[PDB]
Amino acid sequence: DEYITQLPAGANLALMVQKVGASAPAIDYHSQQMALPASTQKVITALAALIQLGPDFRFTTTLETKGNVENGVLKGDLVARFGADPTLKRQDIRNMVATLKKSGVNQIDGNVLIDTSIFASHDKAPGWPWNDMTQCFSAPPAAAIVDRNCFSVSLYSAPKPGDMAFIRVASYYPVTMFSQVRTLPRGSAEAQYCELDVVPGDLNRFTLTGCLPQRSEPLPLAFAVQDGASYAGAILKYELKQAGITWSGTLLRQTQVNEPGTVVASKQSAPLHDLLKIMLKKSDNMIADTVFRMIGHARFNVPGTWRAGSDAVRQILRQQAGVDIGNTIIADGSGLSRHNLIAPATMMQVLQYIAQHDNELNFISMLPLAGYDGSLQYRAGLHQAGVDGKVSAKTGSLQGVYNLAGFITTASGQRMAFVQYLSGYAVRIPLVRFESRLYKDIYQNN
Ligand SMILES: *C(=O)[C@@H](NC(=O)/C(=C\CC)c1csc(N)n1)[C@@H]1NC(C(=O)OCOC(=O)C(C)(C)C)=C(COC(N)=O)CS1
């Protein structure tokens, strides 16, 4: 009430603070008003994941044979069955292929199948901004992921202005780069409104367009792979050839559910509890979103889709956590989607459940701890409020958005849950002053 005055009038605050297990809140300010959660969405994802999949779930990738092996020759298909493992690396594919060879397969009399049947429909959630789709933080969290589905490129201006700027990319990235970038003389009138753009095409083609001012060093750029299956296929095909394995057929995608072949090689991710800790400490969208469609797959035994994920999380929260989210909209796991819409009061029910079951979930220890390595290592409001070491909370940050959801231990040692949904802060002083006062008050007055 007094605090709100610290913020620009352009800003929208919805805030709830409640003692763990209490029937009534200590602070309740527009707590039923629905807001964009951004990355605080990951709290709900983590909880739904632990309940549905459990802390010991591991993502799985396999090479399977369908057919008889005669004289080093597979009579049939090689199936590379991807499982949305966010942490799969090129070297892992190389290792599985080394294992395939070692098992006695030198030749495939058949097709190489890139099986993505674990998932179906689009690899991008509803409500994701189109313009972010080429950025690594928003890379499609496909069934087929290798080195996070992100690659990097160097863009060099041409020595003579008007000449085409040129692109260097490492041999080990199966992408196709084209440049239509005009190098501008220093001081060109064109430089103010001529954009430098990336335009993705089919089969992991990328075209760079527009203008680049003459510059002395290359411009480093990182892009998201748009077609994870094709990318993973191309890497597998490279690794097969290097290991001297030949095949007569072609690389085909397999999207339809099917019975597994004989598993000849496999890679499993770290256990889910480990991945959810990375996810919560780093706000890792890819772990959040692979987990999210995995939940739907697991709950309903269908290829995982965004809709299946949303229905499953809603159900898990209602039936296992006794939280009816009502009119909340859950669109993804990471909070990237602009369709995600939730009130502090609803997220409070989620936090209350977590605090009440924390000896079981080992959840709170996974959230960023204020003043320690993580997203809250130094958040000036919290530091100045004197609450380093006292707040465990998930951030949700965007231009003009400063969300915080989690727990604080007060001066008297009571634990309080809080949801701070604060947006349109297009107007780092008013925010600091608000949070310094607010968290200082909660800590010392409870
Ligand atoms: C959580 O909010 C995540 N990002 C988003 O949700 C975004 C939009 C959702 C509506 C978003 C749009 S554009 C963009 N880059 N993200 C993840 N959160 C963060 C992060 O912590 O926020 C950045 O600000 C901070 O670093 C502090 C919170 C001040 C510490 C991640 C870091 O950003 C990356 N790209 O450097 C991962 S994305």
Q: What are phi and psi of 164, to 5 degrees?
A: -65, 120
Asked if 245 and 101 count as a contact pair (C-beta separation under 8 A), the reply is: yes
Show which of 212, 227, 242 is a domain's final residue: 227
Handedness of CA 61, 67, 69, 72 (dihedral sign): negative
Q: Are 317 and 418 in the same domain?
A: yes
Total count of domains within the chain: 3
CATH code of the domain in which 77 resides? 3.50.80.20
Is there a single domain that holds both residue 108 and residue 164?
no
307, 301 Cβ separation under 8 angstroms? no
Distance from chain centroid for Cα 193: 32
Same domain for 69 and 181, yes or no, is: no
Q: Concatenate the DSSP letters of all residues of 283-346 into one string.
A: T-HHHHHHHHHHHHHHHHTS-B-HHHHHHHHHHHHHHHH----TT-B---SSS--TT-BB-HHH
Residues 205 and 330 in one domain: no
Q: Are residues 100 and 189 in the same domain?
A: no
Long-range pairs for 338-341: beta carbons < 8 A, 24 or more residues apart: 338/36, 338/127, 338/128, 338/129, 339/125, 339/126, 339/127, 340/36, 340/37, 340/38, 340/41, 340/127, 341/34, 341/35, 341/36, 341/37
Q: Is 160 one of the annotated binding-site residues? A: no
| Same domain membership, residue 312 and residue 384 | yes
Q: Which domain holds residue 389?
A: 1-58+270-446
Q: Which residue puts its alpha carbon closest to atom 26 of ligand 1? A: 375
Q: What are the CB-based long-range contacts (under 8 Å, 24+) for 370-378? A: 373/281, 374/281, 374/282, 375/281, 375/282, 375/283
Picking from 227, 258, 283, the residue at the C-terminal end of a domain is 227
Q: How far apart are the CA of 38 and the centre of ligand 1, in A? A: 8
* Of the residues 199, 227, 255, the one at which a domain ends: 227
Structure-determination technique? X-ray
Q: Which of 137, 284, 382 to mutate to test the pocket of ligand 1 (most atoms within 8 A of CB)?
A: 137
446 shares a domain with 399 = yes
Å from CA of 183 to ligand 1 middle:
32
Select from 282, 429, 396 the least CA-distant residue to 14. 396
- Are 54 and 203 in the same domain? no
CATH number of the domain bearing residue 384: 3.40.710.10
Q: How far is the CA of 34 from the centre of ligand 1 (A)?
A: 20
Could you tell me if 209 and 252 lie in one domain? no
State the catalytic residues: 39, 42, 283
Residue nearest to atom 9 of ligand 1 (CA): 336
The answer on 244 and 346 residing in a single domain is: no
Q: Are residues 435 and 287 in the same domain?
A: yes
Same domain, 263 and 285: no
Cα gap 118→295, rounded to integer Å:
11
- Cα–Cα distance measured from residue 48 to residue 28, given in angstroms and rounded to the nearest whole number: 26
